[PDB]
Design an enzyme around this catalytic site. Structure first.
Site, short mmCIF file in Angstrom:
data_model
loop_
_atom_site.label_atom_id
_atom_site.label_comp_id
_atom_site.label_asym_id
_atom_site.label_seq_id
_atom_site.Cartn_x
_atom_site.Cartn_y
_atom_site.Cartn_z
N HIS A 120 42.40 30.83 -19.38
CA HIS A 120 42.03 29.39 -19.32
C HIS A 120 41.71 28.93 -20.73
O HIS A 120 41.43 29.73 -21.63
CB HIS A 120 40.86 29.12 -18.37
CG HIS A 120 39.57 29.80 -18.62
ND1 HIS A 120 39.25 31.04 -18.10
CD2 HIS A 120 38.44 29.40 -19.30
CE1 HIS A 120 38.00 31.32 -18.46
NE2 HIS A 120 37.47 30.39 -19.19
N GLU A 146 44.53 21.65 -13.64
CA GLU A 146 45.62 22.60 -13.68
C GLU A 146 46.93 21.88 -14.03
O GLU A 146 47.20 20.80 -13.48
CB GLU A 146 45.77 23.37 -12.36
CG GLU A 146 46.74 24.55 -12.47
CD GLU A 146 46.82 25.42 -11.23
OE1 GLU A 146 46.91 24.88 -10.12
OE2 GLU A 146 46.81 26.65 -11.40
N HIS A 197 45.32 23.86 -32.88
CA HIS A 197 45.86 22.89 -31.92
C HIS A 197 46.40 23.61 -30.71
O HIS A 197 46.65 24.83 -30.71
CB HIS A 197 46.89 21.95 -32.55
CG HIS A 197 48.17 22.58 -32.92
ND1 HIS A 197 48.38 23.19 -34.13
CD2 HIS A 197 49.39 22.66 -32.30
CE1 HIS A 197 49.64 23.61 -34.18
NE2 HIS A 197 50.30 23.32 -33.08
N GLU A 254 49.78 18.92 -28.73
CA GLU A 254 51.20 18.84 -29.04
C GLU A 254 51.96 18.93 -27.70
O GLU A 254 51.55 19.68 -26.81
CB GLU A 254 51.59 20.02 -29.94
CG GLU A 254 53.07 20.14 -30.28
CD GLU A 254 53.42 21.40 -31.03
OE1 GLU A 254 52.46 22.10 -31.49
OE2 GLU A 254 54.63 21.70 -31.17
K LIG Z 1 58.31 21.59 -33.63
MN LIG Z 2 35.55 30.43 -20.10
MN LIG Z 3 52.33 23.82 -32.70
#
Ligand SMILES: [K+]
Ligand SMILES: [Mn+2]
Ligand SMILES: [Mn+2]
Ligand SMILES: [K+]
EC number: 2.5.1.18
Lengths: 134, 134
Positions: A7, A41, A64, A110
């Site tokens: 997670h 989820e 990221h 992203e």
């Molecule tokens: K890319």
């Molecule tokens: Mn955790």
């Molecule tokens: Mn990336």
């Protein structure tokens, strides 16, 4: 011994704003909510939002979190988030379409077309500076 | 339309140290290394390490990254990393065994037994304050 990602937990200052972002703009399913957090989820990804009302977001660095997207869905996603006023933090330069955007706290996100195998294949054909493979 | 987690990218001040930690201590496979980063894989997880001069790690908040582990391996993993001198950042309190440890930069990691469904089932029996399910 470890098996993969279990997670992802993000600190959030404004829990309602973050749930709405991840659920309604990014399409996560809200599975549970409580006074101090939420569980969502997306595919096999378990996202935890942890309410931290004084949280100011991360400082500026390259950490990221990238979510996958199919090629045919990419343009529509980028256009939709742009039209919603989402802020970008990077213009794509690496293999595969990518849209680099901020969440309500400034976590760096992203949406990416491709995977590790497509990246490695593109890098084999054009390795990065000093690059070596397994 | 997003599909799940595609990759996790971490800023690292000491790229050699971080590769050693994720590869040799945590069992990630090193797939590629270059002057400014590395790509590793653990199960389906694509990890990228991005060299970041003078990066000092995240500030203190609950943002963290959890990796899965089987019940039968949990105790020996925790013992191994304790023996190696890894620093812990939290003593487990939520459902399922968890070991909460720091990487070389101070990214917050977790090794966890369980999944979103096991968590939701346990929470329905012992709910957090104001918890709602759906
Ligand atoms: K890319
Ligand atoms: Mn955790
Ligand atoms: Mn990336
Ligand atoms: K736990």
């Amino acid at each position: 011994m470890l098996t993969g990602l279990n997670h992802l937990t993000l600190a959030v200052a404004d829990l309602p704003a973050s749930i709405a972002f991840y659920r309604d703009l990014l399409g996560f399913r809200l599975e549970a909510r409580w006074d101090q957090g939420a569980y969502l989820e997306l595919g096999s990804l378990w996202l935890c939002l942890s309410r931290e009302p004084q949280y100011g977001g991360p400082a500026a660095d390259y950490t990221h979190y990238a979510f996958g997207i199919a090629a045919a869905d990419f343009a529509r996603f980028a256009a939709q988030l742009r039209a919603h006023g989402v802020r970008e933090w990077k213009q794509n330069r690496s293999e595969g379409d990518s849209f680099y955007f901020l969440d309500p706290d400034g976590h760096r996100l992203e949406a990416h077309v491709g995977d590790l195998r497509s990246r490695l294949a593109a890098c084999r054909q054009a390795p990065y500076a000093g690059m070596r493979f397994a």
